[PDB]
Write an enzyme that holds these catalytic residues in place. Structure first.
Site, PDB file in Angstrom:
ATOM      1  N   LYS A 111     -10.169  -2.891  -4.918  1.00 12.34           N
ATOM      2  CA  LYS A 111     -10.606  -1.557  -4.792  1.00 12.34           C
ATOM      3  C   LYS A 111     -12.105  -1.399  -4.928  1.00 12.34           C
ATOM      4  CE  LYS A 111      -6.321   1.164  -5.661  1.00 12.34           C
ATOM      5  NZ  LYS A 111      -6.531   2.332  -4.734  1.00 12.34           N
ATOM      6  N   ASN A 121       3.436   2.768  -5.249  1.00 10.46           N
ATOM      7  CA  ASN A 121       2.224   3.054  -6.054  1.00 10.46           C
ATOM      8  C   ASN A 121       1.812   4.473  -5.868  1.00 10.46           C
ATOM      9  OD1 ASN A 121      -0.673   3.384  -4.717  1.00 10.46           O
ATOM     10  ND2 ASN A 121       0.648   2.186  -3.362  1.00 10.46           N
ATOM     11  N   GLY A 148      -3.795   6.908  -7.070  1.00 11.79           N
ATOM     12  CA  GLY A 148      -4.588   8.104  -6.985  1.00 11.79           C
ATOM     13  C   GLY A 148      -6.053   7.760  -6.822  1.00 11.79           C
ATOM     14  N   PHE A 149      -6.407   6.746  -6.070  1.00 10.46           N
ATOM     15  CA  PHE A 149      -7.788   6.501  -5.812  1.00 10.46           C
ATOM     16  C   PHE A 149      -8.631   6.257  -7.076  1.00 10.46           C
ATOM     17  CE2 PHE A 149      -8.329   8.744  -1.417  1.00 10.46           C
ATOM     18  CZ  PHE A 149      -7.817   7.629  -0.786  1.00 10.46           C
ATOM     19  N   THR A 198      -3.309  11.609  -2.758  1.00 10.67           N
ATOM     20  CA  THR A 198      -4.390  12.588  -2.984  1.00 10.67           C
ATOM     21  C   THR A 198      -3.965  13.858  -2.231  1.00 10.67           C
ATOM     22  OG1 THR A 198      -6.152  10.996  -3.396  1.00 10.67           O
ATOM     23  CG2 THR A 198      -6.878  13.172  -2.797  1.00 10.67           C
ATOM     24  N   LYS A 213      -7.483   4.991   9.453  1.00  9.77           N
ATOM     25  CA  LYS A 213      -6.228   4.465   8.901  1.00  9.77           C
ATOM     26  C   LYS A 213      -5.239   5.617   8.758  1.00  9.77           C
ATOM     27  CE  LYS A 213      -4.267   1.526   5.267  1.00  9.77           C
ATOM     28  NZ  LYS A 213      -4.664   0.607   4.179  1.00  9.77           N
ATOM     29  N   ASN A 224      -0.814   2.782   6.531  1.00 14.51           N
ATOM     30  CA  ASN A 224      -0.762   3.023   5.049  1.00 14.51           C
ATOM     31  C   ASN A 224       0.698   2.951   4.607  1.00 14.51           C
ATOM     32  OD1 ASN A 224      -1.627   3.767   2.391  1.00 14.51           O
ATOM     33  ND2 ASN A 224      -3.472   4.694   3.384  1.00 14.51           N
ATOM     34  N   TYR A 226      -0.590  -7.176   1.764  1.00 20.09           N
ATOM     35  CA  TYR A 226      -0.886  -6.968   0.377  1.00 20.09           C
ATOM     36  C   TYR A 226       0.351  -7.213  -0.491  1.00 20.09           C
ATOM     37  CZ  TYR A 226      -2.616  -4.344  -3.749  1.00 20.09           C
ATOM     38  OH  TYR A 226      -2.993  -3.866  -4.945  1.00 20.09           O
TER      39      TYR A 226
HETATM   40  C1  1KL Z   1      -1.308 -16.070 -15.499  1.00 22.39           C
HETATM   41  O1  1KL Z   1      -1.627 -15.613 -14.140  1.00 22.39           O
HETATM   42  C2  1KL Z   1      -1.841 -16.597 -13.216  1.00 22.39           C
HETATM   43  O2  1KL Z   1      -1.595 -17.768 -13.448  1.00 22.39           O
HETATM   44  C3  1KL Z   1      -2.200 -16.143 -11.877  1.00 22.39           C
HETATM   45  C4  1KL Z   1      -2.394 -14.863 -11.778  1.00 22.39           C
HETATM   46  N1  1KL Z   1      -2.541 -13.676 -11.759  1.00 22.39           N
HETATM   47  C5  1KL Z   1      -2.343 -17.036 -10.958  1.00 22.39           C
HETATM   48  S1  1KL Z   1      -2.426 -18.778 -11.236  1.00 22.39           S
HETATM   49  C6  1KL Z   1      -3.162 -19.127  -9.705  1.00 22.39           C
HETATM   50  C7  1KL Z   1      -3.027 -17.800  -8.896  1.00 22.39           C
HETATM   51  O3  1KL Z   1      -3.178 -17.878  -7.619  1.00 22.39           O
HETATM   52  N2  1KL Z   1      -2.671 -16.805  -9.677  1.00 22.39           N
HETATM   53  C8  1KL Z   1      -2.389 -15.508  -8.998  1.00 22.39           C
HETATM   54  C9  1KL Z   1      -1.132 -14.987  -9.092  1.00 22.39           C
HETATM   55  C10 1KL Z   1      -0.811 -13.797  -8.423  1.00 22.39           C
HETATM   56  C11 1KL Z   1      -1.767 -13.158  -7.706  1.00 22.39           C
HETATM   57  C12 1KL Z   1      -1.475 -11.820  -7.035  1.00 22.39           C
HETATM   58  O4  1KL Z   1      -2.061 -11.577  -5.974  1.00 22.39           O
HETATM   59  N3  1KL Z   1      -0.724 -10.966  -7.731  1.00 22.39           N
HETATM   60  C13 1KL Z   1      -0.364  -9.696  -7.433  1.00 22.39           C
HETATM   61  C14 1KL Z   1       0.040  -8.830  -8.420  1.00 22.39           C
HETATM   62  C15 1KL Z   1       0.491  -7.529  -8.184  1.00 22.39           C
HETATM   63  C16 1KL Z   1       0.476  -6.990  -6.899  1.00 22.39           C
HETATM   64  C17 1KL Z   1       0.924  -5.560  -6.700  1.00 22.39           C
HETATM   65  C18 1KL Z   1       2.242  -5.256  -7.489  1.00 22.39           C
HETATM   66  C19 1KL Z   1      -0.242  -4.547  -7.029  1.00 22.39           C
HETATM   67  C20 1KL Z   1       1.223  -5.239  -5.181  1.00 22.39           C
HETATM   68  C21 1KL Z   1      -0.034  -7.848  -5.946  1.00 22.39           C
HETATM   69  C22 1KL Z   1      -0.417  -9.178  -6.149  1.00 22.39           C
HETATM   70  C23 1KL Z   1      -3.022 -13.710  -7.614  1.00 22.39           C
HETATM   71  C24 1KL Z   1      -3.359 -14.868  -8.291  1.00 22.39           C
HETATM   72  C1  FMN Z   2      -0.958  -0.965  -5.088  1.00 26.86           C
HETATM   73  C2  FMN Z   2      -1.501  -0.521  -3.769  1.00 26.86           C
HETATM   74  C3  FMN Z   2      -2.701   0.116  -3.663  1.00 26.86           C
HETATM   75  C4  FMN Z   2      -3.217   0.529  -2.443  1.00 26.86           C
HETATM   76  N1  FMN Z   2      -4.395   1.159  -2.336  1.00 26.86           N
HETATM   77  C5  FMN Z   2      -4.892   1.496  -1.153  1.00 26.86           C
HETATM   78  C6  FMN Z   2      -6.213   2.134  -0.969  1.00 26.86           C
HETATM   79  O1  FMN Z   2      -6.923   2.343  -1.936  1.00 26.86           O
HETATM   80  N2  FMN Z   2      -6.582   2.444   0.276  1.00 26.86           N
HETATM   81  C7  FMN Z   2      -5.830   2.197   1.349  1.00 26.86           C
HETATM   82  O2  FMN Z   2      -6.248   2.489   2.426  1.00 26.86           O
HETATM   83  N3  FMN Z   2      -4.663   1.600   1.230  1.00 26.86           N
HETATM   84  C8  FMN Z   2      -4.148   1.236   0.074  1.00 26.86           C
HETATM   85  N4  FMN Z   2      -2.939   0.614  -0.004  1.00 26.86           N
HETATM   86  C9  FMN Z   2      -2.167   0.393   1.235  1.00 26.86           C
HETATM   87  C10 FMN Z   2      -2.250  -0.982   1.827  1.00 26.86           C
HETATM   88  O3  FMN Z   2      -3.564  -1.106   2.257  1.00 26.86           O
HETATM   89  C11 FMN Z   2      -1.307  -1.131   3.018  1.00 26.86           C
HETATM   90  O4  FMN Z   2      -1.673  -0.191   4.007  1.00 26.86           O
HETATM   91  C12 FMN Z   2       0.160  -0.975   2.624  1.00 26.86           C
HETATM   92  O5  FMN Z   2       0.451  -1.379   1.316  1.00 26.86           O
HETATM   93  C13 FMN Z   2       1.066  -1.749   3.583  1.00 26.86           C
HETATM   94  O6  FMN Z   2       0.869  -3.110   3.587  1.00 26.86           O
HETATM   95  P1  FMN Z   2       1.776  -4.134   2.709  1.00 26.86           P
HETATM   96  O7  FMN Z   2       3.185  -3.765   2.951  1.00 26.86           O
HETATM   97  O8  FMN Z   2       1.440  -5.455   3.165  1.00 26.86           O
HETATM   98  O9  FMN Z   2       1.410  -3.866   1.308  1.00 26.86           O
HETATM   99  C14 FMN Z   2      -2.438   0.243  -1.236  1.00 26.86           C
HETATM  100  C15 FMN Z   2      -1.239  -0.397  -1.336  1.00 26.86           C
HETATM  101  C16 FMN Z   2      -0.743  -0.789  -2.559  1.00 26.86           C
HETATM  102  C17 FMN Z   2       0.584  -1.512  -2.662  1.00 26.86           C
HETATM  103  O1  ORO Z   3      -5.015   4.787  -4.523  1.00 32.21           O
HETATM  104  C1  ORO Z   3      -3.923   5.020  -4.084  1.00 32.21           C
HETATM  105  O2  ORO Z   3      -3.064   5.631  -4.667  1.00 32.21           O
HETATM  106  C2  ORO Z   3      -3.506   4.658  -2.687  1.00 32.21           C
HETATM  107  C3  ORO Z   3      -4.333   4.904  -1.647  1.00 32.21           C
HETATM  108  C4  ORO Z   3      -3.884   4.637  -0.361  1.00 32.21           C
HETATM  109  O3  ORO Z   3      -4.540   4.840   0.643  1.00 32.21           O
HETATM  110  N1  ORO Z   3      -2.653   4.186  -0.227  1.00 32.21           N
HETATM  111  C5  ORO Z   3      -1.858   3.981  -1.255  1.00 32.21           C
HETATM  112  O4  ORO Z   3      -0.758   3.557  -1.087  1.00 32.21           O
HETATM  113  N2  ORO Z   3      -2.282   4.224  -2.480  1.00 32.21           N
END
Ligand code: 1KL
Ligand code: FMN
Ligand code: ORO
Length: 365
Positions: free
Chosen positions: A69, A114, A117-118, A187, A224, A253, A325
């Site tokens: 972010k 999620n 809320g920015f 938002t 977007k 989104n 993501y």
């Molecule tokens: C104790 O934690 C670790 O060992 C991690 C971490 N932490 C490690 S050891 C090497 C590594 O690669 N990692 C890692 C794991 C997950 C993610 C990740 O991208 N996690 C993740 C968490 C939450 C979300 C959402 C629920 C916000 C979508 C997305 C991705 C990124 C890095």
């Molecule tokens: C935790 C979270 C936070 C996000 N925050 C934003 C944001 O700040 N701005 C935005 O444009 N999209 C945001 N997204 C949306 C992602 O950019 C994407 O459009 C959406 O999650 C779909 O892709 P995915 O299924 O691979 O996650 C967010 C998504 C997640 C899960």
């Molecule tokens: O910050 C957030 O809540 C957020 C922004 C956005 O564009 N998309 C989303 O899923 N969450």
């Protein structure tokens, strides 16, 4: 690979079990920013290169907005193997976002909900963060690794267009592309900025501000959109994008819908739903916007990509690039190379010379 299995079958279920999703996100951002990541064994082949938005992209798989972010982990994200990075959303002033908890994992659905809320460090903080690595970025961009910045609006703003214009002026000069995110579900009033003479008024102001930047500092501007648009809204957006010469679209989104069949206990939490349940809603919205724009407007396709097949489906529907993501919470970082490897294999299997040849292929069937 062995990493792919260990992360999906052992490490991520363990992390998930110990940490709530917000805490896990924050740890992930820290680990990434320190480069504590598995090796990205995957070597990008030439077949994955795409030229679009005034740039080379070494591979078409990017990190979607919302992971980094505040621009804290950009270099780490390249290390993960992403072809491009998008940071944000960034708001003009710092703001906290919604109260905790505000992020929910739906493991039975491979989904997340999620309502952040920015939450944002704000423009000035991020500006300074990007300035510290500006030249390092210019080299990355030149080497096919561009940087996008997604711009938001503050919760209490009285003039949305002015918030976006501030973002263009402050961060535009540091970005290869900007995103006007008029699609957060979290938002109040924001997604209404997707309607007509008013979307045209907003976008006209954003483009004017962009065109005022010096040529080397002049980013592409993308819009977007949500996956919950009406047919009328879709048509209107396509119309305006053509009329004003918006450079591209990010589709999509998260969704405020709740598809039938969700199993997670947390399915009825307020917020945007991401991951597998959004996948085909997003692919279909790519498809429709590609056709409404006559294939002339580049699309970044996003929503529920966790495999090469999912990436290729979006490319064939009209995406030039893809982002992911939510797959990282289930698969971890090894998902990036998995997607790329699988995409390369499929492209060869379906007789495409490269990604570029597959873009919009379903519309020529
Ligand atoms: C104790 O934690 C670790 O060992 C991690 C971490 N932490 C490690 S050891 C090497 C590594 O690669 N990692 C890692 C794991 C997950 C993610 C990740 O991208 N996690 C993740 C968490 C939450 C979300 C959402 C629920 C916000 C979508 C997305 C991705 C990124 C890095
Ligand atoms: C935790 C979270 C936070 C996000 N925050 C934003 C944001 O700040 N701005 C935005 O444009 N999209 C945001 N997204 C949306 C992602 O950019 C994407 O459009 C959406 O999650 C779909 O892709 P995915 O299924 O691979 O996650 C967010 C998504 C997640 C899960
Ligand atoms: O910050 C957030 O809540 C957020 C922004 C956005 O564009 N998309 C989303 O899923 N969450």
């Amino acid at each position: 690979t062995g990493d792919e299995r260990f992360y999906a079958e052992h490490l991520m279920p363990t992390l998930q079990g110990l940490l709530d999703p917000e805490s896990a996100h924050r740890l992930a951002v820290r680990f990434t920013s320190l480069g504590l990541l598995p090796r990205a064994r995957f070597q990008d082949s030439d077949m994955l290169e795409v030229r679009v938005l005034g740039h080379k992209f070494r591979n078409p798989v990017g990190i979607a907005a919302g992971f980094d972010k505040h621009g804290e982990a950009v270099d780490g994200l390249y290390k993960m193997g992403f072809g491009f990075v998008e940071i944000g959303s960034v708001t003009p002033k710092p703001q906290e976002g919604n109260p905790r908890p505000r992020v929910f994992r739906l493991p039975e659905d491979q989904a997340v909900i999620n309502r952040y809320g920015f939450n944002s460090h704000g423009l000035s903080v991020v500006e300074h963060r990007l300035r510290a690595r500006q030249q390092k970025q210019a080299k990355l961009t030149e080497d096919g690794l561009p940087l996008g910045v997604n711009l938001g609006k503050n919760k209490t703003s009285v003039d949305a267009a002015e918030d976006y214009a501030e973002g263009v002026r402050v961060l535009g000069p540091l970005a290869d592309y900007l995103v006007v995110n008029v699609s957060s579900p979290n938002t109040a009033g924001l997604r209404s900025l997707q309607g007509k003479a008013e979307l045209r008024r907003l976008l006209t102001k954003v483009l004017q501000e962009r065109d005022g930047l010096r040529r080397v500092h002049r980013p592409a501007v993308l819009v977007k959109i949500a996956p919950d648009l009406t047919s009328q809204d879709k048509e209107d957006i396509a119309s305006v994008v053509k009329e004003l010469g918006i450079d591209g679209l990010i589709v999509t989104n998260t969704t405020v819908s709740r598809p039938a069949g969700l199993q997670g206990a947390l399915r009825s939490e307020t917020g945007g739903l991401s991951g597998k349940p959004l996948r085909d809603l997003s692919t279909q919205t790519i498809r429709e916007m590609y056709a409404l724009t006559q294939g002339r407007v580049p699309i970044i396709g996003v929503g529920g990509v966790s495999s090469g097949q999912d990436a290729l489906e979006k490319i064939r529907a009209g995406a030039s690039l893809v982002q992911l993501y939510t797959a990282l919470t289930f698969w971890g970082p090894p998902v990036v190379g998995k997607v790329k490897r699988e995409l390369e294999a499929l492209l060869k299997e379906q007789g495409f010379g490269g990604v570029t040849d597959a873009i919009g292929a379903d519309h020529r069937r």
